[PDB]
Amino acid sequence: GYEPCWLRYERKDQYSRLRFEEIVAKRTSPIFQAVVEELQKGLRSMMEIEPQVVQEVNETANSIWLGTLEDEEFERPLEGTLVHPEGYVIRSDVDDGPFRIYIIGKTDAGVLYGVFHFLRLLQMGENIAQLSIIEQPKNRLRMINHWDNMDGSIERGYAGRSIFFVDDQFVKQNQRIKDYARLLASVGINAISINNVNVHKTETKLITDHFLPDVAEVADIFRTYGIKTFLSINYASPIEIGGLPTADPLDPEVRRWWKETAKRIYQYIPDFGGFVVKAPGPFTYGRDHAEGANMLAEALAPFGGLVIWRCFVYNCQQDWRDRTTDRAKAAYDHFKPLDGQFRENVILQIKNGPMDFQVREPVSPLFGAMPKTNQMMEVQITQEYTGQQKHLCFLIPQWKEVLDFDTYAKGKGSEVKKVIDGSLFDYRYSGIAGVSNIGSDPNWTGHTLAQANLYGFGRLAWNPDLSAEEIANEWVVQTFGDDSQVVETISWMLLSSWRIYENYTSPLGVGWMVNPGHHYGPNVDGYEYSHWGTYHYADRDGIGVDRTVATGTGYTAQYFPENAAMYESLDTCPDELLLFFHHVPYTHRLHSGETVIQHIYNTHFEGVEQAKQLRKRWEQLKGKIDEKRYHDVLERLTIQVEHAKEWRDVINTYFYRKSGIDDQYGRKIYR
Amino acid sequence: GYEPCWLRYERKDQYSRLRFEEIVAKRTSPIFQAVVEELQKGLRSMMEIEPQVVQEVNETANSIWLGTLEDEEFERPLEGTLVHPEGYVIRSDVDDGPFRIYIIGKTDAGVLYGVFHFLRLLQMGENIAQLSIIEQPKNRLRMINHWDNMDGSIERGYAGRSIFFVDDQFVKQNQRIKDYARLLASVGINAISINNVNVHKTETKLITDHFLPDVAEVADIFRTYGIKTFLSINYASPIEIGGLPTADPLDPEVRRWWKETAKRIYQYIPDFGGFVVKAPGPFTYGRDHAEGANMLAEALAPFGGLVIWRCFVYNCQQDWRDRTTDRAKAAYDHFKPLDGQFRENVILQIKNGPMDFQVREPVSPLFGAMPKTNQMMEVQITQEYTGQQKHLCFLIPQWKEVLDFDTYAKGKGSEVKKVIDGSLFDYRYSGIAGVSNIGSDPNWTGHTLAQANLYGFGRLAWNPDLSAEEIANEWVVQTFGDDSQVVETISWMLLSSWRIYENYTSPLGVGWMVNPGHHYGPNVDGYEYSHWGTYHYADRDGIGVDRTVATGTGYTAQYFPENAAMYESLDTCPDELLLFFHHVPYTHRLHSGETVIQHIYNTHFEGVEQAKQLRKRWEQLKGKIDEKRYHDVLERLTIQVEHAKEWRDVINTYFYRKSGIDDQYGRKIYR
């Protein structure tokens, strides 16, 4: 019915097998049961062996040992250094007797992640004769947000319908949920919100007795795979389903209603993760988001729940005429002032950028600006503005640029990753969340290669220091095999895809220029005169948003001095973000030597040629990939090439018609 | 529940009444029954009298006589000249005895229209002491097309939900259908298609036994008011509900299926009007529209049904890059060549313009170009591109410009009205159709004053020679009374509204510049790079579509020599249509003396001020109009003023940003 994605566990040849007679499972918990089953599955499929599962080591048998520190006979030094609950150690016994692999986790979850790491080593064909590994995740929260609706639709879903809901109910099918959990767990994802942040009528009832049994059934599966379950809530629930006259967070009965709702939820799901909130809301009653979030936080506190408060807030009724109002400044101006007013179990979830998941956006100034408030970054795996899984776009490189961005909050070495992993400000709760890119499509992600974005998200969530190169390598090998041509080719495609897509879309960081509504395809003035605050201000002389303090919106001042100065100056501002920070003449000379207008022409003409190359390189792999996936991808790559041509021409023509400046190289621009 | 619109029958004062003791109804048919009931209603409400209904004249009683020629004792000369079946004569007896009013119709329908004319005279307070009237409609078909869907929605409906359907079924309520029929009949409308031309799944079943009983129930009501009922059909019905493998009009079984469908329909509705068709279609199987239409025509022929084939056909996948392809030429190039190949009961329905109901479009070249093919013009009463009933837009003046347009098909005096009334080419069937502007809203049309467009459509349909001035006068008096200030003010508002709306929307006939999808509001580049063939080609130097033969698409050649030459020349082409026919520099000087760019600024700034005046004039009527309607309209006028400001600024800014030319008068243009 559907692909196994990167958990193929392809059968090894006779020269790449392992000899094991037993699996020693020191524990019998539901998680351990899933761990054992997964190990059996991988070893059976890959090695064609079926070790017996036991609870005590057989001194003379080759074994894989699974357990926690408390299960050890002799606690060696390495595992003794473990402090993170989800951390683990994998080491081969150094003695000369039977072969033994020890997978030691700080907790059961640790053993689960350790096993998937062990299986990953096998899929990649690593020598496990002398292993000595210690791994602890950097981010406490490694979450996935689903924008699934209960009618089956998925907001911004380009990979089919929801695998959770249908006909305003839960799918009677749960086997796919189990395989999805296995996939998420394989890359360390430990938290999930199953419903759209835009909570509609039916979804509002997910926190009521009518649907809680079903939610609990889903949570039971995820729990088995070390995944905590969350629900996006409707802030107006007290009114819509509570029978109350208001949703005011300060109203005594409203506060009580939520506390009772929390209690009720925990009776079905004892380890419920908490609420994800997109917010009639607090503003409706003159309350600020601290008051709004803290009320929900107080309801969940007794149960250990968390409130994930999204900071995607802005004036969705902005006047395009007013160049003093800047949507990019909204998030910071709204939350920065509230630092230190939020309850301990509240985590502010902030998008990587201050606008809205554009192909390229500078880093949200909020990161590093709130020392006393937990923060978590939200990235979008589903490609809303990045190709919608029609165009290939491996998002890992972009996410690393964001994660490695130094905010200088506490001087050099204050990278975003250190802000969200909680080390910089000692955040009790923090991490990263990704908007799911899956659907009912057999290949899960619409575009076969988009599977790499989900895999990659998990890898970065676990350890942001991993290189895009090794993440791509791991994914390709596990998904398509180790043929050097296949690996080198697909890895190259993945690693260069984002830049290629940006080349023929929005120029120099200004973003947008997409069709309104569905957001797919070129439309330079699409939202140019809208009330969404997404403008490029292109005219016959130049383009760009002046966000300088000197003459613009003053957005640059939201960054710490080092970055503020870099963007403030027209001479130091990076080319790739120039139009996001400065309004400049088309003739303005970039650091690359190109005028702004010629740069536009260059990347659009050249981006299309690069897209053709992606397709050509893929075609050269025919015969080395099964026919089904070969054609699924070829189909998409062709769709990409044809659409890229539309992006190229629409943008080139628009700017030629406005600037009146011809392409330096005389390439075809339709007048 | 809803307003009576123009059939108010307001109670007259004691000095404006009539003395009648009897109504002589010479016939007992369902139509006559409705006629009598309407007369009783009007006389009771207006005159507070209740004449007894009799079948024989009382020599000594003041009476209103109703009958046809065959019912007359003495057939006078006037009614003796009647030839049209729906014509009638109204004359006061010239003798000195009792007062007698004779309403003589050629057929029952004629008597119905005669009575409504009599009632109209009373509502307007005309002296009926010495009447001598003869009226015969110019257009055989005076039709209304409904874009209602069975789920209750109305495509391009801005006046509420369908009054016909709900929950994929017919409304159990029929009283509103009766009052709607009364309204349509009052203005001579004699035909109606009750469902959307875009026939969806459920609507496709309107031609099956499952829904025919309901359709018949609706048709029974309309029949009583002289209205023939039609259904829009799904050309693919043979496949969707017929169980056949194809819809090919030349497939033997397909032809048979339609003939059987027709027979079945006529068993429920003996006088069924026929099918309205928007067309898997003939093109799908390499057949032309003559073959497509003739197949349906052959099925209806034995029953006297008609096939209304819409010519709204074009490449909905046009390349914006190709300036040689012109959507405006499509309709003519598609149908002109087929003249003389259509069956006698087929009528080609053509929109007033060759594009798509824009605020201003030149006349469709098809009118006058097909001497051997019946034609009917389609106009849009619902204001899709003309304010959507938020902005006031009395469409009658525009329709008269189209109707009075001389095609010169047979030399001077070949106006569009003479083409569609069938007199120019002796068309057996022809006329005019209007896309309904009603909905479930209590005031029927969303905007109270939009009621005038429905009324006006009927009046022009009956007699295109009626002036916009008298049509507006009739409507205002009947709807709001005869206070001279009220009449003069509302009439002025109606008569100037269209020009006002055009002033702040699309300039000089180029059209569009609307938001995509819903089509409401400014968005200059909205469809500029779309595949719909709706482009203005504005750049930093000029704007316009070159449709000349000399250098453009050659669209001008579709008109007869006299009009072709007028539009072909840049010097003779009317300003109001200049950008539809020529691409010109912004500095091009118009006949008005304005440069094209300054004209744009002028009409947009001034159009807003004119809109403010509409509101001001309405406010001055407070106290002379009931509070409910006064405020309903004031609300809309305020909405109009505010939106006009958006139209003004968006368009002015777009062209300033592109042309770089400032407003001559230094008015506020946001940079």
Ligand SMILES: CO[C@H]1[C@H](O)[C@@H](O)[C@@H](O)O[C@@H]1C(=O)O
């Ligand atoms: C779920 O709503 C989404 C929305 O579809 C998307 O287009 C954007 O505006 O951001 C959103 C968000 O992150 O709330």
Ligand SMILES: CO[C@H]1[C@H](O)[C@@H](O)[C@@H](O)O[C@@H]1C(=O)O
């Ligand atoms: C019913 O479809 C409509 C359509 O809503 C409208 O936007 C336009 O394109 O013309 C149509 C037509 O007259 O078929």
